[PDB]
Structure formats: C-alpha cells, structure tokens
Amino acid sequence: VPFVEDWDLVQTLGGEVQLAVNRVTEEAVAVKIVIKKEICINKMLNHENVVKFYGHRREGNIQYLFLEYCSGGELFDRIEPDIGMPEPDAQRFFHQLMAGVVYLHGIGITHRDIKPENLLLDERDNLKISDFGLATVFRYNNRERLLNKMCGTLPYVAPELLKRREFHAEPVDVWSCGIVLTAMLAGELPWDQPSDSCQEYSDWKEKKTYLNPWKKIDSAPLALLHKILVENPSARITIPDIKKDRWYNKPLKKGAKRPRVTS
Ligand SMILES: COc1cc2c(cc1OC)=C1N=NC(c3ccc(-c4ccc(O)cc4)cc3)=C1C=2
C-alpha cells in the first residue's frame, strides 16, 4: 500500500513535540524531535496508563520519536488556578496515576519528574504518564540501586533529594504523586521546595492545616496527604498502603455518561 509511511506535521504540541497525521489512514501521533536511554526505557513500556512508544527514526543529527497522541491534552489544563477540580475527577485521575506508577516501579523504572504537565489525557480522559527523559532503572537483576542524582522540578521533589546524598527511588515518585494530588484538589502548589527555609513547608510539618492549600481540601483526601507528604522517606506511605486508604476506596464518581432513552 503506497504512502502509508508518510506523516504530515499539523501543529506544535510542546526539543519540540509535533502532532503528526498519516497521509493515507489519518492516524494521529505525537512526534518528538531531538536520548539513547530515553528510547531504551520507552521500548520496555507497555501499559494502559503509560504513553505508547511506536518507534524511532534517526536522520543524521535529528532523532524522531513516534509516540501516542493524547487528544485530552495535559492534566495541567484540567486544574483551575486556586480551585482545582471536582474531588471525584481527582480520585479517578489519582487511581490511574497509581496504576501507571505501580507498573513502572514493578519493572524497576522510576520516572523522576511526575507533575501535571507530564500527565496526559486520551480521548476518554484516561491518564497517561509521559516524558521518560529523566527516567532511570533503579532495580536490575532483583537488586536495588540507590539514587544520588538531583532531578525533577523543585515544587514536586521529595525533601530527601535535597538533604541526603543517597535515597530510595520509589518514595520520591510517591511524594510527587502527593504534590499532584494537592494541585488537583486545591489548584495551587503548597511550597517552592520541601526545605526548613521554606515557611510553607515548615507550617505543613507543624500541622497548620487551617492555612492554604490544605483548608480547601476535605479531611478524607487530606488524611491521605498527611501519609504521603511525610519528610522521612522510610516512614512515608507506600503504594500498596495508598491502595488501602479510606478516601482512595471512597465511592465518589459515576461511570462515563452512557447514551439512554425513556419509555
Ligand atoms: C498542550 O496541549 C497538548 C500537549 C500534548 C498533547 C496534546 C495536547 O493537546 C491536545 C500530546 N499528545 N501526546 C503528547 C506527547 C508528548 C510527549 C511524550 C513523551 C513520551 C516519552 C518520552 O520519552 C518523551 C516525551 C509523549 C506524548 C502530547 C503533548
């Protein structure tokens, strides 16, 4: 079948990311224009809450990464500044975020930069983890490797990354997921960074939940945030225990609006 391999670049999505449309079939894909680690990690990935990798092509200097187009856009744009989003939506997005992170950690992969800009939504608003540019292997041949590299985005990083020389990879991703949950429910980030010099971080450690963003958050999701945003990574709640939390398992959201008629 001729021309099936020809893609037209339609518009800029976010190096640069372009919306690419097939000449013959009109299938939409995201093309990232730029690496060797990012491609190898992306080849390992296959999960319903992780952005799909179709393949890669190199034209001399430029690397073309062919990835899943997510028409719902970024989770970032579903968060209303200083308000957030309805709690049932946040619970559903947090469920899918946990499924994706369980998957990654299960195959020994740490994302290291979880934030709403990197969380994409497909046509049916299914959350997809994206951007494995800062991702690394923390478990190989069933042997854990402690991390020491400084990476991520300061409002989302765990405090051990700023205070300790070495740290376990999994509690760092758990912490950023808790900052994402804060953002979804309050529409604001609690601190610039998790340090004693940060007044907002000190107030949280002093349990001053009468202040923002915490006063906007209901006691059930806030009790979960109290277990995730724990300064000691060894005391911090793990994903298996996040899955047993009362709010995590609280019935809140109805299913997708199904078409129906009466009489
Ligand atoms: C700003 O609006 C959008 C941003 C968007 C999209 C849609 C948007 O609006 C509908 C979109 N779809 N796929 C992407 C997209 C972007 C980046 C990746 C990605 C995945 C793995 C990786 O190693 C590096 C980057 C994978 C997919 C994207 C950015």
Curated annotation (Swiss-Prot):
GO terms for cellular component: centrosome; chromatin; condensed nuclear chromosome; cytoplasm; cytosol; extracellular space; intracellular membrane-bounded organelle; nucleoplasm. Its EC number is 2.7.11.1. The active site is at residue 113. Keywords: ATP-binding, Cell cycle, Chromosome, Cytoplasm, Cytoskeleton, Disease variant, DNA damage, DNA repair, Isopeptide bond, Kinase, Nucleotide-binding, Nucleus, Phosphoprotein, Serine/threonine-protein kinase, Transferase, Ubl conjugation. Residues 7-248 form the Protein kinase domain. Expressed ubiquitously with the most abundant expression in thymus, testis, small intestine and colon. One of its GO terms (molecular function) is protein domain specific binding. The keyword Cytoplasm applies. It is found in: Nucleus; Chromosome; Cytoplasm; Cytoplasm, Cytoskeleton, Microtubule organizing center, Centrosome. Phosphorylated by ATR in a RAD17-dependent manner in response to ultraviolet irradiation and inhibition of DNA replication. Phosphorylated by ATM in response to ionizing irradiation. Changing residue 113 to A: Abolishes kinase activity. ATP binds at residue 32. Activated through phosphorylation predominantly by ATR but also by ATM in response to DNA damage or inhibition of DNA replication. Activation is modulated by several mediators including CLSPN, BRCA1 and FEM1B. Proteolytic cleavage at the C-terminus by SPRTN during normal DNA replication activates the protein kinase activity. It is an enzyme of class 2 (transferase). The modification Phosphoserine is found at residue 263. Belongs to the protein kinase superfamily. CAMK Ser/Thr protein kinase family. NIM1 subfamily. The autoinhibitory region (AIR) inhibits the activity of the kinase domain. It is linked to Oocyte/zygote/embryo maturation arrest 21: An autosomal dominant, female infertility disorder characterized by zygote development arrest due to failure of pronuclei fusion. Interacts (phosphorylated by ATR) with RAD51. Interacts with and phosphorylates CLSPN, an adapter protein that regulates the ATR-dependent phosphorylation of CHEK1. Interacts with BRCA1. Interacts with and phosphorylates CDC25A, CDC25B and CDC25C. Interacts with FBXO6, which regulates CHEK1. Interacts with PPM1D, which regulates CHEK1 through dephosphorylation. Interacts with TIMELESS; DNA damage-dependent. Interacts with FEM1B; activates CHEK1 in response to stress. Interacts with TLK1. Interacts with XPO1 and YWHAZ. Interacts with CDK5RAP3; antagonizes CHEK1. This is Serine/threonine-protein kinase Chk1. It comes from Homo sapiens (Human).
